[PDB]
Each structure stands twice: as structure tokens, then as C-alpha cells.
Amino acid sequence: KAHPPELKKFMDKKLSLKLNGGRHVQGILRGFDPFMNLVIDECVEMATSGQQNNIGMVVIRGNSIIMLEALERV
């Protein structure tokens, strides 16, 4: 207990992140903690309009992470 999420396999891979609020972003996994809070580099916001905007390196709180999908092969 106080377990890690099993995410080493996904480290330094490009990912597609579905967040709550119908929000979606894409970026490279740079790290994580036991709460599933993530560090995502070269992150891009995929606006509901279809337009995408570069936001750089960011922190996503694991709380609000619905789902992730790898855009690479692990």
C-alpha cells in the first residue's frame, strides 16, 4: 500500500490524455507519483473546436485523469 501506478512502461512515450470536463491533451510522460499525478512534456491542448495549442511542460493531477492512451508502442 501507498502503491505506485505501474507506468514505467509508459515513461518518455507520447500519450493521449482524457481528462474530466470533456477535456483532452497530448504529450510525453516525464514522471508520476503514487497519486497518479503526472508530469507531461511538450503538452498540447486539443480544444473542442478542433484547434490545438502548445502549452509546454505541465502537471496533471491524478484526481482528474479519466483515461490515458499511448500513441506509441510499449
Partner: protein, 77 residues
Amino acid sequence: IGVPIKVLHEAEGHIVTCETNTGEVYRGKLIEAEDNMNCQMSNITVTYRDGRVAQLEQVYIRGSKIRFLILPDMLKN
């Protein structure tokens, strides 16, 4: 450790269906299931709330944001 959790770990390597808190439905092979219900899957078919389908190679869903899972009947015995 909970009885249902042991039965979930038993389904690793089997084809399972997962509905999220938002009602997206993911069907494919369960690779890894963590104690907190965090789920790694592969070769997915996803069926959205509008009915449309898509295909994904690799996914990982947080346990909290899972509403439920359907497991094989191979386990029931």
C-alpha cells in the same frame, strides 16, 4: 485485500469490457489490474456515448474513474 480484487487479477490475460464514469465502453485484453482497480489493456474497441466505435492499441484507465467491468464467465466456477 478484497475478494472481488483477487477475482479481477484472475481475469488478467482475458478479454474484458470496461465502462468508465463517463460511459465510454472499452473492450479488449486485460494486461494488468492494480489493487486500486487501475487497468492496463490492449487492442481495444471503444464505443462512445453517441454509439460510434474506434480502435486503440494500448490504454490505461484509473480505477476511480471506472464504473464497472465485465469479466469472462470462465471465472465463475
